[PDB]
Amino acid sequence: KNPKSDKFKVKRFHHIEFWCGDATNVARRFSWGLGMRFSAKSDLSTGNMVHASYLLTSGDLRFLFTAPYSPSLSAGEIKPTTTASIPSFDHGSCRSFFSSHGLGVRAVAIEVEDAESAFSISVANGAIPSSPPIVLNEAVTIAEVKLYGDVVLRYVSYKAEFLPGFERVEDASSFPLDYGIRRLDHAVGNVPELGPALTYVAGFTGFHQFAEFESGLNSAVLASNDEMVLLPINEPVHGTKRKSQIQTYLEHNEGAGLQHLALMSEDIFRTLREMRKRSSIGGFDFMPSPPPTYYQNLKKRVGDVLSDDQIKECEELGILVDRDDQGTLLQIFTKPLGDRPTIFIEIIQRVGCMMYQSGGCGGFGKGNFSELFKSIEEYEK
Amino acid sequence: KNPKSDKFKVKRFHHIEFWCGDATNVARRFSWGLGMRFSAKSDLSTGNMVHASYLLTSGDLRFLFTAPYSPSLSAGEIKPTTTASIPSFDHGSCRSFFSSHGLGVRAVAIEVEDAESAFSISVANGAIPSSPPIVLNEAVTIAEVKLYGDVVLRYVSYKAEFLPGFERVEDASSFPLDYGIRRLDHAVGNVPELGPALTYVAGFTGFHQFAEFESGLNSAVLASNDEMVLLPINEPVHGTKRKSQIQTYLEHNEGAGLQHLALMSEDIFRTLREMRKRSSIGGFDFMPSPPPTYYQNLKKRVGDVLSDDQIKECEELGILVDRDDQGTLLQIFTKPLGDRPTIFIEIIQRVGCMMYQSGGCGGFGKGNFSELFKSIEEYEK
Ligand SMILES: CCCSc1nnc2c(C(=O)Nc3nnnn3C)ccc(C(F)(F)F)n12
Ligand SMILES: CCCSc1nnc2c(C(=O)Nc3nnnn3C)ccc(C(F)(F)F)n12
Ligand SMILES: [Co+2]
Ligand SMILES: [Co+2]
């Protein structure tokens, strides 16, 4: 069921912006850990006296890392005379965000046909405005509305190099890392109450519910017309034996926010080999692998899609596998990206649904919860 | 001239503590960039509900990275019932420090015979108290006094594993990196006025002035009895043609603070090869190399100490060389460690003065300022 009810034309995920206290160290760590190239900058060396922003790219994936300078550097400016390249930036908002939440995503940015129209229609349909539409160098238009917590949905549209005022970084510093990651597949929020969050976001976007197929989790996925923009949201289920990890998130994050980013790889094996080689030398750690029972139970479930060698290759890398009625999903989860048990990354590869590949092919791994319970108890034997 | 006037017994530099917004990403970046092993932790997994602290070690060098959790996690605690492993930590102080200064050094920590005595004698001699002496698990005593800006001099003494409450990190995560760095040689402050800063610090420590031999810099070095604890301080010289980099520091740092950390390497060539290999893949960048004239002028100055091959090896790595009347100094400087043009690192190796090697052998490279001016103009030809 796809009513295709988008209230304005949405294209693809454009970028994800992290608000940091020091953009340099987070960007360099992520670049090495994920194999993403330094591709653009806006900072003191480009005349930005307001914020330091560094863009990493891998395929179509764009990660932006931004931190405030001392307000004193820009004390003489006013909004008409700002040197910030992202006009929505606010020193106080940024410092308040990072002291409240620590390292996390401030903006989920989607590209649209007309950012001013998208903002207007959104606000007309219940969206809480965050930053009004602003036209940068007559070329790009940016506007922001509240999504959940202190996370914003950022609309970007081009009349026709990331943003104006960003410079291409010198080749020297730019080193061509690549572990196979290619695009953002979905971005997931954690909220206290799923109902009101869904009503709000579906209300101002027109995104529809993506149909799916005791873990402390209720969730639903909002999707654009071609289901390439996927925004799942989770709520906790209280009273369970093991404490809901959504509830732990809300407590350590000081409320709602972005929980995980799913990054599509063109070869999840190459990606997981390359990231795991770097786990203990500055990269990212992965959640503990499932017990070998899990992989001894995979033949009965996906033996038609993956060979005995590829299923073996799953076991060494700790990859999980799930399956829709339309496709198959390979997935694995990092440990939290920073100090707090809040944001983490998911690496995924989807197989099936070739018409190009349709969005959400194979689902989001909801069955891997139940299979992860049956794994453990069956192994305990 | 060494009066040996220490007002209490000082041993060696013990550790340097960075105050961060996310300790994880800074620690992982530094570990890869400098070849330092993850060696101890105090965080949620060890019962610390207050701050996340991660210790990197290379030889005797200890770098500690600390960031606050949400105050909500520890809202029920009081100082007698704290789960912080560093009792001086304060959420508000830490957030205020990082929003004011960005990433930087909060504590220069020296080991002493008796931290309570050192604190008492210091305060009796004009030191501004920061955190009174506290005995941790009847084993270690920590106390802090103001050094300059928001940097503290931290006294640590042991009756007899970093600090109580810190756990040894699992071997898995611990990967034995090592690029040859071995100990902290000196830690340098930038202040608006050198005179009052020196009078203050020499006043409460008894440290003496270490004798030395148009760059916008006046400086002096305070030293302990055996001159193994070296604390240089700089002030700007205004009115010069090129703006004093000390003044730029003060402006971007919002006042006085730690400018650079000099790390002694047992083989500066191995270190600089290994760090430079990683500059564009998550490590540290170095200041631009001097022009080849500089190395064409080295034979006439240090040809008695370094071979033609080692002087050639200087040129490829960009190493600078200076010389006292007692020894020779090899040195090089990183670009700033984070977003702001504030803190950076110096890598050094000293040759000469073997009695063990006496402190400050070869000086601090003050002549490399003048030789760096003569380099450029002579090259311009
Ligand atoms: C970090 C350890 C917690 S385990 C975890 N956390 N998330 C997930 C997802 C997921 O991606 N769900 C999802 N994506 N978009 N919408 N929704 C609901 C699938 C499977 C698992 C599994 F199998 F590991 F339990 N997850
Ligand atoms: C980052 C680029 C600025 S150039 C710079 N910045 N610092 C230094 C030092 C130093 O270490 N001085 C020092 N150490 N302890 N006390 N003092 C005074 C020596 C030589 C140079 C040189 F040659 F590059 F100009 N430096
Ligand atoms: Co997911
Ligand atoms: Co120095």
What are the φ and ψ backbone dihedral angles of A215, each rounded to 5 degrees?
A: -100, 10
Residue with tokens 């197929």: A213
Q: Give the C-alpha separation, B335 to B315, whole Å.
A: 18
CB contact at 8 A, B50 and A51: no
The burial class, CB within 10 Å (0-12 / 13-18 / 19+), for B199 is exposed
Using a 6 Å cutoff on CB, does residue B344 contact ligand 2? yes
Nearest to A227 by CA among A61, A123, A346, A364: A364
CB contact at 8 A, B15 and B62: yes
User: Residue B78: beta bridge partners?
Assistant: none
Helix (H) or strand (E) holding A11: strand A10-19
Q: Give the C-alpha separation, B197 to B199, whole Å.
A: 6
Q: Give the C-alpha separation, B152 to B64, whole Å.
A: 14
What are B43's two structure tokens? 């965080």
- Work out the number of other CB atoms within 10 angstroms of the CB of residue B35: 22
Q: Give the C-alpha separation, A234 to A242, whole Å.
A: 17
Nearest to B218 by CA among B245, B254, B200, B199: B245
CB contact at 8 A, B152 and B104: no
- Find the distance separating the first CA and the last CA of chain B, reported in whole Å: 43
Nearest to A297 by CA among A321, A333, A332: A321
Contact A174 B280 (CB under 8 A): yes
What are B341's two structure tokens? 């043009």
Q: In chain A, which residues have their Cβ closer than 8 Å to the Cβ of B28? A: 29, 33, 282-283
What are the φ and ψ backbone dihedral angles of A162, each rounded to 5 degrees?
A: -55, -70
Distances A117 to A8, A13, A205 between C-alpha atoms, Å: 8, 18, 12
* Helix, strand, or coil (residue A363): coil
Q: Give the C-alpha separation, A133 to A29, whole Å.
A: 32
The burial class, CB within 10 Å (0-12 / 13-18 / 19+), for B136 is middle
User: Residue A143: beta bridge partners?
Assistant: A155
Q: Give the C-alpha separation, A36 to A283, whole Å.
A: 12
Using CA atoms in the order B121, B123, B129, B132, what is the torsion angle rounded to 10 degrees? 40
Contact A339 B73 (CB under 8 A): no
* Helix, strand, or coil (residue A307): coil
Residue of the CA atom closest to atom 14 of ligand 2: B364
For strands A104-112 and A151-158, give the pairing. Answer: parallel
b/e string for A187-207 if b means 16 or more Cβ within 10 A? bbbbbeebeebbebbbebbbb
What are A198's two structure tokens? 């869904």
Nearest to B40 by CA among B20, B15, B19: B15
User: Residue A261: beta bridge partners?
Assistant: A187, A345
Distances A376 to A314, A380, B150 between C-alpha atoms, Å: 17, 6, 51
CB contact at 8 A, A20 and A43: no
What are B375's two structure tokens? 């380099």
Q: DSSP secondary structure string, A230-263?
A: EEEEEEE-TT-SSPPHHHHHHHHTTS-EEEEEEE
Nearest to B103 by CA among B253, B286, B247: B253
Q: Does A173 touch chain B (CB under 8 A)?
A: yes
Q: Is B252 annotated as a binding residue?
A: no
Which residue type does A60 have?
Answer: D
Distances A294 to A31, A256, A291, B176 between C-alpha atoms, Å: 32, 32, 6, 33
| Method in brief | X-ray
* Helix, strand, or coil (residue A372): helix
Q: Do domains A10-173 and A181-380 have the same CATH topology?
A: yes
- Å between A203 CA and nearest CA of chain B: 32
Fold for the domain defined by A10-173: 2,3-Dihydroxybiphenyl 1,2-Dioxygenase; domain 1 (3.10.180)
Which ligand gives the minimal distance to the CA of A334? Answer: 1
Mutate to test the pocket of ligand 1, among A287, A366, A371 (most ligand atoms within 8 A of CB): A366
Mutate to test the pocket of ligand 2, among B244, B345, B366, B376 (most ligand atoms within 8 A of CB): B366
- For this entry, resolution in Å reads 1.8
Nearest to A105 by CA among A149, A136, A69: A149
Name the residue facing B340 among A38, A69, A285 (closest C-beta): A69
Q: How many helices (H) and strands (E) does chain B have?
A: 10, 17
Q: Give the C-alpha separation, A66 to A97, whole Å.
A: 12
Q: DSSP secondary structure string, B31-63?
A: HHHHT-EEEEEESGGGT-SSEEEEEEEETTEEE
The DSSP secondary-structure symbol of A116 reads H
User: Residue B350: beta bridge partners?
Assistant: B329
Select B181-380's CATH number: 3.40.50.970, 3.40.50.300, 1.10.3720.10, 3.10.180.10.
3.10.180.10
Name the residue facing B25 among A25, A99, A254 (closest C-beta): A25
- Work out the number of other CB atoms within 10 angstroms of the CB of residue B337: 26
Nearest to A35 by CA among A273, A205, A236, A207: A273
CB contact at 8 A, A63 and A56: yes
Name the residue facing A70 among B32, B44, B254 (closest C-beta): B254
Nearest to A91 by CA among A54, A52, A50: A50
Q: Is A14 annotated as a binding residue?
A: no
- Ordered by start, the domain boundaries in chain B are 10-173, 181-380
- Work out the number of other CB atoms within 10 angstroms of the CB of residue B319: 25
User: Side-chain half-sphere of A90: how many Cα atoms within 13 Å?
Assistant: 8
- Work out the number of other CB atoms within 10 angstroms of the CB of residue A139: 12
What are the φ and ψ backbone dihedral angles of B94, each rounded to 5 degrees?
A: -65, -45
CB contact at 8 A, B114 and B157: yes
Nearest to A351 by CA among A290, A295, A267: A267
Contact B32 A31 (CB under 8 A): no
What are the φ and ψ backbone dihedral angles of A249, each rounded to 5 degrees?
A: -55, -55
Using a 6 Å cutoff on CB, does residue B372 contact ligand 2? yes
Residue of the CA atom closest to atom 6 of ligand 1: A333
CB contact at 8 A, B210 and B269: no
User: Residue B148: beta bridge partners?
Assistant: B151
Task: Find how far residue B219's CA is from the centre of its chain.
Answer: 16
What are A284's two structure tokens? 């990212």
Helix segments in chain A, DSSP class H: 23-34, 91-101, 115-124, 194-205, 245-252, 268-277, 292-296, 299-302, 308-317, 367-380
User: Residue A134: beta bridge partners?
Assistant: A142
Q: Give the C-alpha separation, A147 to B321, whole Å.
A: 56
Using a 6 Å cutoff on CB, does residue B219 contact ligand 2? yes
Contact B175 A280 (CB under 8 A): yes
Q: Give the C-alpha separation, A299 to A306, whole Å.
A: 8
Q: Does A340 touch chain B (CB under 8 A)?
A: yes
- Work out the number of other CB atoms within 10 angstroms of the CB of residue A123: 16
Residue with tokens 């930005």: A48
Using a 6 Å cutoff on CB, does residue A333 contact ligand 1? yes
Contact A280 B173 (CB under 8 A): yes
Residue with tokens 């730019």: A174
Distances B280 to A168, B30, B104, B297 between C-alpha atoms, Å: 15, 13, 22, 30
Strand order in the sheet with B217-223: B208-209, B217-223, B230-236, B181-190, B257-265, B344-352, B327-333, B320-323
Contact A285 B173 (CB under 8 A): yes
Helix segments in chain B, DSSP class H: 23-34, 91-101, 115-124, 194-205, 245-252, 268-277, 292-296, 299-302, 308-317, 367-380
- Work out the number of other CB atoms within 10 angstroms of the CB of residue A242: 8
Contact B21 A25 (CB under 8 A): no
Nearest to A290 by CA among A333, A349, A244, A243: A333
The burial class, CB within 10 Å (0-12 / 13-18 / 19+), for B304 is exposed
> Which atom of ligand 2 is nearest the CA belonging to B344?
1
Which residue type does A258 have?
Answer: L
Distance A245 CA to ligand 1 centre (A): 11
The burial class, CB within 10 Å (0-12 / 13-18 / 19+), for A178 is middle
The DSSP secondary-structure symbol of B267 reads -
Q: In chain A, which residues have their Cβ closer than 8 Å to the Cβ of B24? A: 337-339
What are A354's two structure tokens? 């070739």
- Work out the number of other CB atoms within 10 angstroms of the CB of residue A226: 15
Residues 79-138 of chain A whose Cβ lies under 8 A from any Cβ of chain B: 95, 98-100, 102-103
Q: Give the C-alpha separation, A368 to A356, whole Å.
A: 26
What are B169's two structure tokens? 């990190």
Contact A72 B254 (CB under 8 A): yes
Distances A182 to A35, A58, A61, A259 between C-alpha atoms, Å: 11, 6, 6, 20
The burial class, CB within 10 Å (0-12 / 13-18 / 19+), for B277 is exposed
Q: Is A260 annotated as a binding residue?
A: yes
Query: Over the Cα atoms of chain A, what is R_g?
Result: 21
